[PDB]
Amino acid sequence: GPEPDMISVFIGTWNMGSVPPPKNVTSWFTSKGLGKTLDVTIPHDIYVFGTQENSVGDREWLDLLRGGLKELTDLDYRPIAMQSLWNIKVAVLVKPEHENRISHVSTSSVKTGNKGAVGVSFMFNGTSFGFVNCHLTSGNEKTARRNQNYLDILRLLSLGDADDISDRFTHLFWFGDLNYRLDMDIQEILNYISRKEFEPLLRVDQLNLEREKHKVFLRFSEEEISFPPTYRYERGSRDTYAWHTNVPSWCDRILWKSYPETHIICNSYGCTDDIVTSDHSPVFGTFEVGVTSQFISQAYIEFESIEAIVKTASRTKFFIEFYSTCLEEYKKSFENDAQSSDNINFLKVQWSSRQLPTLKPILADIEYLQDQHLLLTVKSMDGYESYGECVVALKSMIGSTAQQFLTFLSHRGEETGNIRGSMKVRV
């Protein structure tokens, strides 16, 4: 009980339109405006600010953010880190008291016009966080290029540390001017916007469509959108869309991907309507997020069997590597001892208990172990390349009797099958 079990995280994304911001951006910080909004006078534990087309210097911009929070909260928020890629910038600020809870800070950037992404990662006690702020390709017809920018960022971002960042963090937030547009005629768009009927517009949102096709943001969630398209506004008010062609669109988005059986709840998601220097409106999202401090405040993990369904026609043997922060070093299986055809595109590979390792956690405490996760990777014996990664929560696995886990494999932005197994955690 002495340490935090839960924190409140603010994420903001704002394309500043290459002009100075207004002195007062308080509405952004406080989730005031349109959509799912707040009233709450209680400052967040962490503020993450992502910006695009930001012409304010790195230091000056950080000073504006600290000064604004100081004015709002009377606390001096501490920069954990900041990363810029020319006019694409991200800053993470934290309440003074959490300074000593932060460790393993990392930053990275990927350039894909200035387009690309900047990232920050760290641990908060035993829980890891990643934040990716991006500006993807512009224009209604450039969906394929946006998708490719996403894949390049995913592949090249060197945050944390696996093959890519998608499974590296307990909670991964990806936000920015993703630049996906509405696939609809201007007249219909404007009619739905005036009547405040966003559901028919969301049906033709290109990001939603590409996510459903499994091209981008595998495993990510986004909160329901109840606020109007944030692009493209005439400057100086929010009365008019400048569409002369740039149809109104939800360019500016916040998404997340979390490890299984963790606590995360979106408390707000919306845009401001009183910040008018840019052709985009700022977007805010706030989250209540579980944090594990059990390590701060003999055990064995055993496997009776594992069965993977893997996208491949290879006749090579396979093994599994097991990684976790609760282990001194990773472990690996022997080769699979049975194999068969699942489908025309998939093989079934099976490891009996004989082929599988016994993992030995760093601490034997039951509450500690309940908050841990294992990263499993299926690799070929010929060349050692990965065919799929997944994450398994220990939460429901504590006992003398083996229980089943079931989850899904991915690799390099593709779904590559599934994995089912029988395990137990003994203390």
Numbering used by the authors: 418 to 456, 460 to 532, 539 to 587, 592 to 674, 683 to 735, 745 to 874
Copy out sentences from the published article reporting this entry, exactly as the authors wrote them.
The two main enzymes responsible for PI(3,4,5)P3 degradation are the tumor suppressor phosphatase and tensin homolog (PTEN), which removes the 3-phosphate (3 P) and the SH2-containing inositol 5-phosphatase (SHIP), which dephosphorylates the 5 P to generate PI(3,4)P2. The SHIP Ptase domain belongs to a family of Mg2+-dependent inositol phosphatases with specificity for 5 P dephosphorylation of inositol rings. Here, we report the crystal structure of SHIP2 containing the 5-Ptase and a C2 domain (Ptase-C2), revealing that the two domains tightly associate via an extensive interface. Importantly, even in the absence of a localization effect, the C2 domain provides activating signals to the Ptase active site, resulting in a significant increase in catalytic turnover.
In order to disrupt the hydrophobic core of the domain interface we mutated F593 and L597 to aspartates (FLDD mutant). Crystal structures of Ptase-C2 FLDD confirm that few hydrophobic interactions remain intact between the Ptase and C2 domains. The FLDD mutations also disrupt interdomain hydrogen bonds between R649 and E862. When comparing the catalytic turnover of the FLDD mutants we find that the C2 domain no longer has a significant effect with either substrate, indicating that the FLDD mutations largely mimic the absence of the C2 domain. We note that the FLDD mutations increase intrinsic Ptase activity with PI(3,4,5)P3-diC8, but importantly the presence of the C2 does not cause any further change. The PS-mediated increase in activity on vesicles is maintained for the FLDD mutant, whereas as with soluble substrates, the increase in activity due to the C2 domain is abrogated by the interface mutations. Removing the C2 domain abolishes observed SHIP2 activity, whereas the FLDD mutations partially reduce activity of the wild-type protein.
